[PDB]
Amino acid sequence: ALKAPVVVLGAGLASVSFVAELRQAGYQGLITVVGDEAERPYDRPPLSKDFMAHGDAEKIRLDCKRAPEVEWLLGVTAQSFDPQAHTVALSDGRTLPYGTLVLATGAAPRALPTLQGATMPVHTLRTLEDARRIQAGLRPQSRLLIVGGGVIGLELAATARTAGVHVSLVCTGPRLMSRAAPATLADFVARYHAAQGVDLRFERSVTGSVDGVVLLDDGTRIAADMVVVGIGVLANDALARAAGLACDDGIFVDAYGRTTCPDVYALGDVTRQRNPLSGRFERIETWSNAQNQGIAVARHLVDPTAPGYAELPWYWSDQGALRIQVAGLASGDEEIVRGEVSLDAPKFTLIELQKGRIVGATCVNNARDFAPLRRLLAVGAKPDRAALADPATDLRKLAAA
Amino acid sequence: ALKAPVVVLGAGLASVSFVAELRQAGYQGLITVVGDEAERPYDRPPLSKDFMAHGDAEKIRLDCKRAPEVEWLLGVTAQSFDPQAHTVALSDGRTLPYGTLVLATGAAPRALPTLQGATMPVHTLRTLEDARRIQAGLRPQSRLLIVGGGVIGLELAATARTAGVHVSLVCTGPRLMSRAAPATLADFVARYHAAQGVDLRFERSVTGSVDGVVLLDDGTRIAADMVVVGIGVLANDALARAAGLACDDGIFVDAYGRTTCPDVYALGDVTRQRNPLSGRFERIETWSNAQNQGIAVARHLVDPTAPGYAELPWYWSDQGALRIQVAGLASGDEEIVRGEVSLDAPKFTLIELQKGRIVGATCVNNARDFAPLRRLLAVGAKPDRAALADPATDLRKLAAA
Ligand SMILES: Cc1cc2nc3c(=O)[nH]c(=O)nc-3n(C[C@H](O)[C@H](O)[C@H](O)COP(=O)(O)OP(=O)(O)OC[C@H]3O[C@@H](n4cnc5c(N)ncnc54)[C@H](O)[C@@H]3O)c2cc1C
Numbered sequence: 001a002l003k004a005p006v007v008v009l010g011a012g013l014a015s016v017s018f019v020a021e022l023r024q025a026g027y028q029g030l031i032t033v034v035g036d037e038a039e040r041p042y043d044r045p046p047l048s049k050d051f052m053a054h055g056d057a058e059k060i061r062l063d064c065k066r067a068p069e070v071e072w073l074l075g076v077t078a079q080s081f082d083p084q085a086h087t088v089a090l091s092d093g094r095t096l097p098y099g100t101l102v103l104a105t106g107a108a109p110r111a112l113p114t115l116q117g118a119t120m121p122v123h124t125l126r127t128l129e130d131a132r133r134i135q136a137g138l139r140p141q142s143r144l145l146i147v148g149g150g151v152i153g154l155e156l157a158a159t160a161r162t163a164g165v166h167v168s169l170v171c172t173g174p175r176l177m178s179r180a181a182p183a184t185l186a187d188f189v190a191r192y193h194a195a196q197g198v199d200l201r202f203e204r205s206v207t208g209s210v211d212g213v214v215l216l217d218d219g220t221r222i223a224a225d226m227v228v229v230g231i232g233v234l235a236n237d238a239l240a241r242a243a244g245l246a247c248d249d250g251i252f253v254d255a256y257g258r259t260t261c262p263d264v265y266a267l268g269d270v271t272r273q274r275n276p277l278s279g280r281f282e283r284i285e286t287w288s289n290a291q292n293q294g295i296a297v298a299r300h301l302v303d304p305t306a307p308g309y310a311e312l313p314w315y316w317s318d319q320g321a322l323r324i325q326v327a328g329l330a331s332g333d334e335e336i337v338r339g340e341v342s343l344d345a346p347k348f349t350l351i352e353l354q355k356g357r358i359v360g361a362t363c364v365n366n367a368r369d370f371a372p373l374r375r376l377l378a379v380g381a382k383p384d385r386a387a388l389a390d391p392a393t394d395l396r397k398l399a400a401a
Numbered sequence: 402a403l404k405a406p407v408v409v410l411g412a413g414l415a416s417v418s419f420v421a422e423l424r425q426a427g428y429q430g431l432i433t434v435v436g437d438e439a440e441r442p443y444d445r446p447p448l449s450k451d452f453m454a455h456g457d458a459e460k461i462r463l464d465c466k467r468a469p470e471v472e473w474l475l476g477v478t479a480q481s482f483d484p485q486a487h488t489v490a491l492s493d494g495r496t497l498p499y500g501t502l503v504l505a506t507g508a509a510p511r512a513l514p515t516l517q518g519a520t521m522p523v524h525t526l527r528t529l530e531d532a533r534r535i536q537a538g539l540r541p542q543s544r545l546l547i548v549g550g551g552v553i554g555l556e557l558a559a560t561a562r563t564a565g566v567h568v569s570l571v572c573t574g575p576r577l578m579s580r581a582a583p584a585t586l587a588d589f590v591a592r593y594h595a596a597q598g599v600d601l602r603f604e605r606s607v608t609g610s611v612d613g614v615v616l617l618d619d620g621t622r623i624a625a626d627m628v629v630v631g632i633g634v635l636a637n638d639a640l641a642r643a644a645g646l647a648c649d650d651g652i653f654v655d656a657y658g659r660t661t662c663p664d665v666y667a668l669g670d671v672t673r674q675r676n677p678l679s680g681r682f683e684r685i686e687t688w689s690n691a692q693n694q695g696i697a698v699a700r701h702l703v704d705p706t707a708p709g710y711a712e713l714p715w716y717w718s719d720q721g722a723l724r725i726q727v728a729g730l731a732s733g734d735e736e737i738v739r740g741e742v743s744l745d746a747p748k749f750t751l752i753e754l755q756k757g758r759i760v761g762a763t764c765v766n767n768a769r770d771f772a773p774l775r776r777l778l779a780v781g782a783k784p785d786r787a788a789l790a791d792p793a794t795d796l797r798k799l800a801a802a
């Protein structure tokens with residue numbers, strides 16, 4: 001079952017979390033990790049936040065201390081694996097044997113086909129190298145265009161505005177943060193960015209570019225010194241596809257992290273997996289999933305009596321003065337708003353319910369509310385709705401009961 | 402790998418096809434099939450066609466001759482399996498051991514929530530028992546309402562009209578056959594059924610029913626003596642879900658039929674699998690898939706050097722005077738129409754292309770065209786488009802080259 005030696009492809013958060021948990025749970029056999037980036041393993045959330053602002057990569061490294069006795073092959077690409085021979089072929093000419101193979105290869109930014117032949121700077125934001133490249137162009141008074149309405153682009157927008165960069169943004173949908181965010185939150189976030197000087201363009205798509213100017217499908221133009229494309233990511237599942245595993249923009253896994261190929265597991269951004277709230281398969285693109293799924297899969301490999309992965313989804317986003325936290329589903333049949341939604345010292349909580357049951361929550365500048373809401377969410381609590389709205393109501397009280 | 406004994410859950414076409422191929426390929430170990438219906442294994446397409454018209458079940462049985470030495474446990478339900486103990490628990494109190502387990506449990510009609518408490522006859526059409534029940538109510542001059550725009554309901558509509566039954570049909574979408582059928586075909590099919598006296602209602606949903614009358618979301622009413630609901634099917638994947646396999650309205654499998662649980666395979670209507678034309682996972686609800694996937698999975702189990710399942714999708718439908726055949730994708734960036742589309746002796750062919758490459762085809766009353774088109778489709782042919790349209794062009798010529 002858990003058969004030595006263990007080989008992990010990818011050296012991001014999911015991989016680090018997984019191998020640390022293998023060691024902590026008591027597995028003492030060989031562990032080898034193959035990472036294509038020639039970088040000490042690092043966390044990605046800082047890249048559009050404090051790193052983009054302050055540039056010190058030695059503040060963003062992952063702690064591999066809880067993963068002793070691991071050989072990290074950095075700057076090496078796994079090119080294929082043979083699931084019958086139980087081997088992995090590396091770009092440096094070597095081959096690794098495995099008893100258990102774990103695919104933790106993440107996802108890469110989608111390219112925008114209409115900007116393929118662009119003759120102006122066009123970047124995406126995924127890696128430390130990407131971040132350094134973009135930062136090297138955040139000249140004060142320069143003009144940045146962001147393509148996409150997702151959180152990473154908005155975090156970059158906020159960082160850029162703080163640095164004195166003019167920012168425009170084009171969004172194909174009618175609202176920002178179309179994925180996994182309540183409409184009430186999305187509408188407020190737009191109001192915030194607009195108030196901070198971001199030039200927002202909704203329901204627009206990029207049709208091309210000419211001599212430093214981007215073209216839109218309404219027949220208009222946006223000049224910029226740099227374009228950062230952030231229209232989502234695609235799973236890095238090429239090795240899995242070639243080896244015959246079930247994949248569809250993501251490697252299908254069950255709650256034990258098993259793929260359709262025996263002795264091969266997958267975790268993190270590369271996986272398509274069950275969302276227990278919706279009961280549907282989804283590719284879950286969050287820090288908490290990478291860590292939590294990695295830990296759960298490792299724990300169950302060492303101890304088969306352990307339950308499968310069961311954590312509910314959540315993420316956070318730091319956008320200027322907004323500290324955003326979102327858990328569970330974006331919507332249900334009811335939203336309860338705790339507090340006022342205002343640009344004057346923003347602070348509020350949203351709760352989404354389905355037939356009385358909490359299925360999601362949002363906190364903006366209220367971390368203290370978020371933890372008890374996540375616990376209520378976890379057991380599908382059906383609290384008193386007026387109490388949920390009432391500001392006199394304390395939420396940590398409810399969760400404890 | 403192929404480990405004896407083999408146990409198959411379900412005794413439909415996929416199961417029969419699979420076990421016959423195991424035997425033909427040379428596997429001589431135990432095979433036991435568990436089938437919940439107390440019926441000699443039978444084919445479903447006749448149920449909305451000649452059986453509905455003529456009633457002889459001994460014309461619709463599957464040939465189990467190519468599957469010698471198989472014990473068929475008919476009228477028995479598999480209630481669970483334990484993938485660690487390698488056992489299956491049966492409704493009759495017995496337990497079966499397995500080396501290889503194959504889930505071939507098909508799919509069941511979706512219920513219509515708004516008709517849940519109906520006090521008038523409401524049926525679905527999946528089984529021989531369903532067909533006999535519906536047929537027992539096809540009184541000449543009676544009124545039948547069909548809910549859904551799919552092929553099975555339309556086949557029933559045609560059968561009913563031929564039998565002198567008044568037929569009305571409510572479709573939530575703007576067109577019939579929304580799944581896997583070109584719009585040109587769907588529009589023609591509506592014209593045909595309307596000409597045969599079917600009362601078609603598009604963009605309408607059922608909101609409920611009262612004392613023999615069905616209510617619609619436009620505030621109107623349709624009286625009927627019987628309602629047949631045909632709004633699609635849901636995979637019978639409950640055993641897989643309970644046992645920890647990756648599922649989402651269908652058991653995920655790769656081209657070898659492997660699930661995420663070692664030693665457990667799945668085939669047929671119950672599976673969610675790669676469509677090689679779209680490159681996306683889909684639940685493929687066709688006779689040809691059930692047979693072809695069953696055969697391919699069996700062949701590769703006995704001979705691991707055999708390729709995985711690779712057949713492209715296709716189906717047929719018999720609707721009164723229309724003998725419809727459809728292969729591949731419903732659309733691309735071009736449709737070529739061979740012949741005229743007319744209610745006067747209907748006979749035409751559609752070809753769908755994507756950047757010059759054939760990705761789909763349709764034949765109405767032209768079986769001779771369909772086989773060569775499927776071969777051209779299979780190798781992604783890029784034929785001369787004017788020739789494809791030209792009636793002087795023979796298609797069997799093209800395929801042979
Ligand atoms: C800029 C940015 C900001 C983010 N902010 C937040 C946030 O505030 N909150 C939040 O919840 N989430 C955030 N995320 C999301 C989060 O960081 C991801 O969910 C997480 O990185 C996924 O981890 P992973 O280990 O699955 O994948 P990855 O981090 O992508 O790691 C995979 C690694 O495998 C490598 N690899 C791929 N193929 C091969 C191969 N064949 N051989 C060897 N190596 C290979 C990759 O190049 C990569 O280094 C952010 C992400 C980015 C990019």
Ligand SMILES: Cc1cc2nc3c(=O)[nH]c(=O)nc-3n(C[C@H](O)[C@H](O)[C@H](O)COP(=O)(O)OP(=O)(O)OC[C@H]3O[C@@H](n4cnc5c(N)ncnc54)[C@H](O)[C@@H]3O)c2cc1C
Pocket residue numbers: 410411412413414415416435436437438444445446447448449477478479480505506507508526527528553637640668669670671685686687688689691715716717718719
């Ligand atoms: C009325 C009708 C007309 C059709 N016409 C056409 C057509 O003209 N062309 C076409 O391409 N396709 C047609 N089809 C589709 C086609 O018949 C299906 O694709 C095919 O039946 C799928 O085969 P299967 O073996 O995967 O599933 P099934 O035929 O559903 O067989 C599965 C069996 O497993 C049983 N089972 C489920 N759970 C358990 C359990 N726990 N224990 C034991 N047994 C269990 C089921 O009850 C069932 O008997 C038609 C289907 C119907 C219903």
